[PDB]
A paper describes a structure:
The intracellular Asp f3 is an abundant protein in A. fumigatus. It contains 168 amino acid residues and BLAST searches reveal considerable sequence homology to the thioredoxin superfamily, the peroxiredoxin (Prx) family, and the PRX5-like subfamily. We experimentally confirm the predicted peroxiredoxin activity of Asp f3 and demonstrate the functional contribution of its cysteine residues for catalytic activity. Finally, we provide evidence for the critical role of Asp f3 in fungal virulence, wherein it protects A. fumigatus against oxidative stress in vitro, and in vivo, in a murine model of invasive pulmonary aspergillosis.
Aspf3 wild type (WT) and its C31S/C61S variant crystallized as a homodimer and showed a typical thioredoxin-like fold. The WT protein was captured in its oxidized state, with two intermolecular disulfide bonds across the dimerization interface between C31 and C61 of the individual protomers. In the WT structure, both C31 and C61 reside in flexible loop regions (large B-factors and lack of well-defined electron density for one of the chains). The crystal structure of Asp f3 revealed its homodimeric configuration that includes two intermolecular disulfide bonds. The dimer interface comprises an area of ~710 Å2 and ~730 Å2 for WT and C31S/C61S variant, respectively. Salt bridges between R131 and D91 from the two protomers and additional hydrogen bonds between main chain atoms (T29-V60, A30-V60, A30-C61), as well as residues involved in hydrophobic interactions (I28, A30, F57, P59, V60, V94, Y93, A97) contribute to the extensive interface interactions. The WT, as well as C31S/C61S variant, exhibited close similarity to oxidized and reduced forms of Ahp1, respectively. The residue at the active site (C61) is the peroxidatic cysteine (CP) that initiates the peroxide reduction by nucleophilic attack, when present in its thiolate form. The second Cys residue (C31) is therefore designated as the resolving cysteine (CR) that participates in catalysis in later reaction step. Disulfide reductases such as a thioredoxin or glutaredoxin return oxidized Asp f3 to its activated, reduced state.
Numbering used by the authors:
A (entry chain A): 1 to 23, 30 to 169
B (entry chain B): 3 to 170
């Protein structure tokens, strides 16, 4: 794909899938990220898969812990992204005890967004990465050097790249 | 696809996480192991049912809960193994198992990696998922095989229908 870097515009027509907040016969609908985020400061972190074990990388739990610090830096939306469908993503959000949309759990259908920028792996999963998108402009972008390497996409690290 | 009388294919391998431990629906540090169904089932009576995906709401198909309700009946008809199959990876399937409050191996939650088995028998869709179907396999021999006519049509693979075929 293309890559993404600071200074780039966030791609247009980026559409994910998700189940909107509450409450259960939730149905997946489109999440038009390009449109929704145009006037927002956003953190988006992607990872290999929902429900990876507790003993492995603490990607999501660290974002939950650092959420007060992230809000203090003026971030409006935090989202986690993976290739799992919106049903699995939504159940994973519940399993992580995230309520009231504090962190959005989004599906990248067939990893098509991730593929379009060259950040999907050989098996159709997203890679592990983070993007800070401020009003449609990328201000932080980092791809982890390996699947279970947690560093450049971590909440701690992303926090150092927020004013 | 598959029909009664046929032999269950050789070298069919699924992925799963054996049940254990504390939390829901998070596996502590479970690790996917190969499940060699062809070999495991050679001397057993088995119900295998597949569906489009883990964590699909019950209001669009009460597939797993009905097998759970019918499990004492199913065992009383001599079935050794009951297994649900889907294209989701073993971590997701294991979580779905806990979310259904299934413990031990009462029902196995198995992954069909990239729907490859389902694909090999022509029972997968274009989206890379398994279709919804059921198989009764008795010591390596298929005695019941039905594919549902639609994705969220639950009839020929339901616990109640499979049971009718067991009782006969």
């Amino acid at each position: 794909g293309s890559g993404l870097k600071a200074g780039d515009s966030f791609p247009s027509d980026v559409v994910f899938s998700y189940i909107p907040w509450s409450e259960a016969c939730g149905i997946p609908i489109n999440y038009n990220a390009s449109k929704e985020w145009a006037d927002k400061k956003v953190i988006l972190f992607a990872l290999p898969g929902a429900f990876t074990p507790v003993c492995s990388a603490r990607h999501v739990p660290e974002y939950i812990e650092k959420l007060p610090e992230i809000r203090a830096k003026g971030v409006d939306v935090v989202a986690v992204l993976a290739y799992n469908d919106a049903y699995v993503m939504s159940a994973w959000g519940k399993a992580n005890q995230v309520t009231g949309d504090d962190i959005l759990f989004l599906s990248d259908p067939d990893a098509r967004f991730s593929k379009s920028i060259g950040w999907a792996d050989e098996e159709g999963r997203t890679k592990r990465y983070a993007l800070v998108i401020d009003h449609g402009k990328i201000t932080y972008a980092a791809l982890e050097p390996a699947k279970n390497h947690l560093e450049f996409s971590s909440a701690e690290t992303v926090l150092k790249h927020l004013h």
